[PDB]
Design a protein around this ligand. Structure first.
Ligand SMILES: Nc1ncnc2c1ncn2[C@@H]1O[C@H](CSCC[C@H](N)C(=O)O)[C@@H](O)[C@H]1O
Length: 257
């Protein structure tokens, strides 16, 4: 497929060439100071990761309207959870991850609405009973040189999420590899059953073909992905181009009643 061609080409790049391509013409969050602040123990204002700004991109465009009880599957440090904790119609946020050595452990913060957020690692979302929620978030998906490996991992995530959804469910779910036939088929059925569409976030690096399945979006799946495969391929042709930066998000401080 067109995406697989992109994948072959990506795997043939040298080290230096990869790092450059990875950032060419993408959008980037200015994280220097937020990171230095967290390192000094600062728990107010800062986003634990660039995932906050990433999720904000979708939310400010109403592609996902987090509300009620939010479940963040694979929350990592908590970037997505903490951001939702400060959102108007959100009442509760539950984030889950593996954590442990060689894995991202959630960081305790005092950002706005932190008291509405509960994080816990040592949990493998794939084998715990599904819970009820109003919005389901999931940013799971480890990339690999081999697209068939990504296809399976992706299909696992899609089936995992299919269990946590009902209808009225707001959702933003990462789809690591959306171009492999197997994943495309699944997405067509899921779209057919739960709506929404796939969207490319300008903050995603060129090194990944990741797209997110957002509930409040529309668009033909096959058409979605290809449009993006062509983009990523075109970006290979770029010379001496870097990312455009933007200020990170300020998450406030304070509790919510
Ligand atoms: N089976 C599983 N169960 C729980 N967590 C998992 C998992 N597989 C992967 N993960 C976690 O999924 C996380 C995805 S990266 C998290 C980004 C987060 N949205 C943020 O903005 O900070 C990784 O940290 C990984 O540790």
């Amino acid at each position: 497929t067109l995406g697989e061609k992109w994948k072959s080409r990506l795997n043939a790049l040298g080290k230096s060439e990869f790092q450059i391509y990875k950032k060419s013409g993408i959008q980037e969050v200015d994280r220097t100071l937020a990171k230095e602040g967290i390192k000094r123990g600062e728990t107010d204002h800062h986003a634990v990761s660039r995932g906050s700004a990433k999720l904000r991109w979708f939310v400010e465009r109403n592609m996902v309207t987090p509300e009620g009880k939010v479940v963040d599957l694979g929350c990592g440090r908590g970037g997505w959870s903490y951001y939702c904790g400060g959102l108007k119609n959100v009442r509760e946020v539950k984030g889950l991850t593996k954590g442990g050595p060689g894995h991202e452990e959630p960081i305790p913060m005092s950002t706005y609405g932190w008291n509405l957020v509960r994080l816990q690692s040592g949990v493998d979302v794939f084998f715990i009973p599904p819970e009820k929620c109003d919005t389901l978030l999931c940013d799971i998906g480890e990339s690999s040189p081999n697209p068939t490996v990504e296809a399976g991992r992706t299909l696992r995530v899609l089936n995992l999420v299919e269990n946590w959804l009902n209808n009225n469910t707001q959702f933003c779910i990462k789809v690591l590899n959306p171009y492999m036939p197997s994943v495309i088929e699944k997405m067509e059925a899921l779209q057919r059953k739960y709506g929404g569409a796939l969207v490319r976030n300008p903050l995603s690096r060129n090194s990944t073909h990741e797209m997110y399945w957002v509930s409040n979006a529309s668009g033909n799946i096959v058409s979605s992905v290809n449009m993006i495969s062509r983009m990523l391929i075109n970006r290979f042709t770029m010379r001496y181009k870097k990312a455009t930066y933007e200020p990170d998000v300020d998450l406030g401080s304070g509790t919510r009643n």
